[PDB]
Amino acid sequence: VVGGTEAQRNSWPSQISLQYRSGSSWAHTCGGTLIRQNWVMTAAHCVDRELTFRVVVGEHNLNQNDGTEQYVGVQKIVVHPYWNTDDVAAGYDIALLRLAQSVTLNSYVQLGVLPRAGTILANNSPCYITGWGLTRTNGQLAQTLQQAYLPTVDYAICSSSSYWGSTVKNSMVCAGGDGVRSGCQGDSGGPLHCLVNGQYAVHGVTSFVSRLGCNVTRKPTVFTRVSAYISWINNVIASN
Numbered sequence: 001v002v003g004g005t006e007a008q009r010n011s012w013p014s015q016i017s018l019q020y021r022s023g024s025s026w027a028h029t030c031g032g033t034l035i036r037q038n039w040v041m042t043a044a045h046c047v048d049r050e051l052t053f054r055v056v057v058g059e060h061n062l063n064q065n066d067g068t069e070q071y072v073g074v075q076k077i078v079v080h081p082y083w084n085t086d087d088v089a090a091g092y093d094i095a096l097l098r099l100a101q102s103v104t105l106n107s108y109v110q111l112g113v114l115p116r117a118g119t120i121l122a123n124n125s126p127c128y129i130t131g132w133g134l135t136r137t138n139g140q141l142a143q144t145l146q147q148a149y150l151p152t153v154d155y156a157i158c159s160s161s162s163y164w165g166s167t168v169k170n171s172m173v174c175a176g177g178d179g180v181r182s183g184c185q186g187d188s189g190g191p192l193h194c195l196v197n198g199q200y201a202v203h204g205v206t207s208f209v210s211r212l213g214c215n216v217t218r219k220p221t222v223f224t225r226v227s228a229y230i231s232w233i234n235n236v237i238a239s240n
């Protein structure tokens with residue numbers, strides 16, 4: 001997250017860190033959202049590689065024992081049937097991970113609430129992106145969970161020429177684009193929390209940014225619109 005601030009320890013309990021084993025250690029690669037005690041929602045492009053993954057919940061500082069972490073393995077990965085490797089502009093950038101074990105819920109580990117199917121947010125809706133991603137373009141990962149106020153940019157504006165044009169689809173959500181704050185490498189697969197009716201719900205799964213850089217003016221961070229896949233999500237968990 002570029003232009004963010006450190007999130008409080010118990011602010012975003014649904015956030016998880018998706019890690020893969022590199023050598024004899026584990027390294028954070030993407031974010032994700034806990035939606036069931038044994039199911040995690042993330043980006044398809046995060047699990048496109050033939051790597052061994054693990055999930056960490058109750059995580060705050062990547063390199064320090066917080067005394068709240070739970071480490072669980074991934075037992076099954078379900079990518080959207082229409083997902084096309086490396087083709088993030090086509091959409092369908094979403095995947096579900098079935099955990100090897102059910103995690104324990106407490107003040108640091110909670111399920112993120114999903115929006116009702118078809119829900120679209122008004123322009124400039126208050127949202128927050130969270131993650132341990134790069135704090136600067138071509139910089140380095142954050143040590144502690146970061147958060148940044150990222151207001152939505154409706155489809156009409158985001159799909160305009162001065163913005164993303166045809167690259168963005170209606171199955172996506174645009175947030176930010178002020179040139180100061182944004183998502184960045186390592187935030188992928190994570191949640192976009194938006195305030196709706198006094199409650200925070202996960203309306204997006206972080207997908208991509210401009211090839212030019214993370215925080216580019218008029219190039220908001222793009223997310224998969226969660227509300228467009230509620231039926232798919234329910235179908236997967238129900239038969240797995």
Ligand SMILES: *[C@@](O)(c1nnc(C(C)(C)C)o1)[C@@H](NC(=O)Cn1c(-c2ccccc2)ncc(N)c1=O)C(C)C
Pocket residue numbers: 029030045046086087088133183184185186187188189206207208209210211
């Ligand atoms: C997303 O954070 C993410 N996913 N993988 C990674 C690495 C491996 C840590 C860099 O970071 C990142 N978004 C993207 O990387 C999306 N992206 C791609 C792309 C496509 C397929 C697989 C990986 C990456 N390609 C081009 C551009 N412009 C992208 O943003 C953050 C959300 C910024």
